[PDB]
């Protein structure tokens, strides 16, 4: 089902083999609330850091504009087996909130998306 014609937006580099479905968010604080309300959260950042770990767990998924073949982002992910992406096309961030424009769609920090980690293919809407 799907994954054969999903309206996928783009595909960055496969940081760590992972699969997740969470709502976009650019803060470890929002994860604390989410993690306590429903979890399933994602994290977008122009740079990854260790201490953010707590934010990493709650964020079983991470789509950043930076990162690379290997770095704190991946290294930490490979250790936490968490799904994470790094270095995408030209994700333009929109302050309207905290979005990122990629492929042919604008993902705003205010929706639900499903990103893959095993080849590096992002998708939106919880598959089923």
From Swiss-Prot:
Phosphorylation of Thr-70 in the dark inactivates the enzyme. Dephosphorylation upon light stimulation reactivates the enzyme. The N-terminal domain contains the ATP/Pi binding site, the central domain the pyrophosphate/phosphate carrier histidine, and the C-terminal domain the pyruvate binding site. This is Pyruvate, phosphate dikinase. It comes from Clostridium symbiosum. Belongs to the PEP-utilizing enzyme family. The modification Phosphothreonine is found at residue 70. Catalyzes the reversible phosphorylation of pyruvate and phosphate. In E.histolytica and C.symbiosus, PPDK functions in the direction of ATP synthesis. Homodimer. It comes from the Bacteria. The active site is at 72 (tele-phosphohistidine intermediate). Residues 17-115 are annotated as: Central. The reaction takes place in three steps, each mediated by a carrier histidine residue located on the surface of the central domain. The two first partial reactions are catalyzed at an active site located on the N-terminal domain, and the third partial reaction is catalyzed at an active site located on the C-terminal domain. For catalytic turnover, the central domain swivels from the concave surface of the N-terminal domain to that of the C-terminal domain.
